[PDB]
């Protein structure tokens, strides 16, 4: 009997990995890593937040059991997530129109949402932005959902081509899902404005598709509250919603897998009914969500002192990012970049498309030991006041 | 436009949640919980293990980042897992034929295996024992895999009906999956003997199906190495295996979601092709596994002093279960039970089928505040020296 695994065809090599091998094997001093997918401080590190440490000490000292919680995870985390997302006093919360399941990251939430949709609804297709987060397609496809792209980023001109977005979405029908990045679009950093969000909200009500809000960077853009404005415009308008939230980035809890899938429906009865089917989706997957990270978040958010410390820590991260964006533009100018990079200061979060070609990226690695990804995505958190000059000089030189 | 969530049909009520809810509402002081699915100590609690508290203190003091690890999680965890499962200095490990992905629980490991199989192999059908752990069917069905049942437990006579097992498995073809519980079969507690495992192993070789060992109770049965004997009997023989292991129970880390999916192929190169595809299944799901629990386990297993502390508390738990099995059997006789229950002491782990009807289970609950699952499954860890008398008096009353 031939093996079950015998004829499996190797998965394509992960370029996210090939590049990271190169970098580690590169012995040149002053190599610059703009390819990384996480936040890094001015020293090139991704530390545990102080607020997070304090909470972990609190859990060490006080937790008395690791016994399972329900499939929807820690209730307090569900409440905190909801208030962060919709704002305290939200009519969604008061009207009990929203149910939240803690999940293993925003990723888990996306997959839970997809399994739930494919299994219980007529949804057959999900619209995502071009470009979008690389993992979106595979998550939805795996649940049997087709993924379509809508127009978003004008790459030659470094803009959110809003007119093209709108027009391309006319092909989306009632009953499709349309996925929108809550804030700090990944990888472009180009976000709708408040009014564009309001327009999008209004169109979704008119067209009848289901919005899904992927919000993984709340607090990395303009501020905690400001970064949710777009979601809340959707909440005021469309009576059904799915939100996949994440604490990986805004709590630097990446590997603890802290996120949430929130269903919103027209009334309590409908959302509760939907939610029982969501539990079934979770039960058929990994069942209970991991407690540690979520308890950390709930401990922090439930406590005023701890909450203050976390918000300042998050603000610091947000402001360093904005500082590097500004410095990048100014230093390219100073070093004589033969074109304008001002778009960089109009974008939010860690990631922008540098607008470099794959040839330029190649040369930047080989010749200057500056590492970006093939798409030209750069992570501005990879920048520091100390590596900026040689970084920008390298870029100027390949233009 | 009509909602997308409007016509979702309600999920069936969850009997496990339902029982848990009824028990919580029961204000009767002598109520007894033999329904829960977790270990409990002589005081009725499910404490965090001393070894785990120590390892969590260590992580608190040492950890300096929470950045993503690979899709297979923490390498030390994978190594400790493989050694626990196959034996240090295993030819499997030596030949580099095994690859381990840390997963969110054995549940996550079962789902990952299922998606992996559906997407990359000719596998259409998974065979499980009647009876089995309740979530098996949901998990494999969600991946589009048909679940079929094979013969296992003789309920009237309280035995593993091994001739029934073998004959019903004749229906299982090459490239089917057949799932076995490694040890402490849930819910019967009736395990194959070594020679039965060897026979089973020889049969799967002859017929050509793919063995999946769900092993969640290593160390709860006869001891760590003894409970792994069945798995090693399969490993010694079959060129391919899948193992879905869990630490929820043997470390009392239930809600941290610590487990693994281990693939085993004929050679390194082949298991590598298989495992990369598995990584793609994980990437389409929750991506990275949750760190905290796997780190705790890696820290404990990798330190001689902590491991000994862990093995001790686990021995305490295994031994407490066996004592309750014995005391239960003995107190039933002394209270006048109208039939013999000595099959109980022969069976392994927290769970046995009591043989009580749903009529009896029901009366037990309502009249005596004694909770068991409708199938009559009982959790002996729900027993103590203090509650044993009222408990056995209740059972005798409904016999």
UniProtKB/Swiss-Prot annotation, chains A, B:
Cytoplasm recorded as keyword: yes
InterPro entries reported for this sequence: Aminotransferase_I/II_large (IPR004839), Asp_trans (IPR000796), NHTrfase_class1_PyrdxlP-BS (IPR004838), PyrdxlP-dep_Trfase (IPR015424), PyrdxlP-dep_Trfase_major (IPR015421), PyrdxlP-dep_Trfase_small (IPR015422)
Impact noted for substituting residue 136 to A: Slight increase in maximum velocity of the overall transamination reaction between aspartate and 2-oxoglutarate
Keyword annotations of the record: Aminotransferase, Cytoplasm, Pyridoxal phosphate, Transferase
A single Gene Ontology CC term: cytosol
Keyword Phosphoprotein found: no
CDD domains tied to this protein: AAT_like
Cross-referenced SUPFAM superfamilies: PLP-dependent transferases
Uses: Has been used to construct a 2,4,6-trinitrotoluene (TNT) biosensor strain.
Cofactor entry: pyridoxal 5'-phosphate
UniProt induction comment: Transcription is increased specifically in response to 2,4,6-trinitrotoluene (TNT) and its indicator compounds 1,3-DNB, 2,4-DNT, and 2,6-DNT.
Superkingdom of origin: Bacteria
MF term (GO), any: L-aspartate:2-oxoglutarate aminotransferase activity
Reaction catalysed by this enzyme: L-aspartate + 2-oxoglutarate = oxaloacetate + L-glutamate
Subunit structure, interactors included: Homodimer.
PANTHER family assigned: ASPARTATE AMINOTRANSFERASE, ASPARTATE AMINOTRANSFERASE, MITOCHONDRIAL
Family in the record: Belongs to the class-I pyridoxal-phosphate-dependent aminotransferase family.
NCBIfam families per the UniProt record, alphabetical: PRK09257.1 (NF006719)
Protein name: Aspartate aminotransferase
Source organism of this protein record: Escherichia coli (strain K12)
Chain's gene name: aspC
């Amino acid at each position: 009997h031939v093996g079950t695994f015998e004829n499996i065809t190797a998965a394509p090599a992960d370029p996210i990995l090939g590049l990271a091998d190169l970098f580690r094997a590169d012995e040149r001093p002053g190599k610059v890593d703009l390819g990384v997918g996480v936040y890094k401080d001015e020293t090139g590190k991704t530390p545990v937040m102080t607020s997070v440490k304090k909470a972990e000490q609190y859990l060490l000292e006080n937790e008395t059991t690791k016994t399972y919680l329900g499939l929807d995870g820690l209730p307090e985390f569900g409440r905190c997530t909801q208030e962060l997302l919709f704002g305290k006093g939200s009519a969604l919360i008061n009207d009990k129109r929203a149910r939240t399941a803690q999940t293993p990251g925003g990723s888990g939430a996306l997959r839970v949402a997809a399994d739930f949709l494919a299994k219980n609804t007529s949804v057959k297709r999900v619209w995502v932005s071009n470009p979008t987060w690389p993992n979106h397609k595979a998550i939805f496809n795996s649940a049997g959902l087709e993924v379509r792209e809508y127009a978003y980023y004008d790459a030659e001109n470094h803009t959110l081509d809003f007119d093209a977005l709108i027009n391309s979405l006319n092909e989306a029908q009632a009953g499709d899902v349309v996925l929108f990045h809550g804030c700090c679009h990944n990888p472009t950093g180009a976000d709708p404005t408040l009014e564009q969000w309001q327009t999008l909200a209004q169109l979704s009500v008119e067209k009848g598709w289901l919005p899904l809000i992927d919000i993984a960077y709340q607090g990395f853009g303009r501020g905690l509250e400001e970064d949710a404005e777009g979601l809340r415009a959707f909440a005021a308008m469309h009576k059904e919603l799915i939100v996949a939230s994440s604490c990986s980035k805004n709590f630097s809890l990446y590997n603890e897998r802290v996120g949430a899938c929130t269903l919103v429906a027209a009334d309590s009865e409908t959302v509760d009914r939907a939610f029982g089917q969501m539990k079934a989706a979770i039960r058929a997957n990994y069942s209970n969500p991991p407690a540690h990270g979520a308890s950390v978040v709930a401990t922090i958010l439930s406590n005023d002192a701890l909450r203050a410390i976390w918000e300042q820590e998050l603000t610091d991260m947000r402001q360093r990012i904005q500082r590097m964006r500004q410095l990048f533009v100014n230093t390219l100018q100073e070093k004589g970049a033969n074109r304008d990079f001002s778009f960089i200061i109009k974008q939010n979060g860690m990631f922008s498309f540098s607008g470099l070609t794959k040839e330029q990226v190649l040369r930047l690695r080989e010749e200057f030991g500056v590492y970006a990804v093939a798409s030209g995505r750069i992570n501005v958190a990879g920048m520091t006041p100390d590596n900026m000059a040689p970084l920008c000089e390298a870029i100027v030189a390949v233009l």
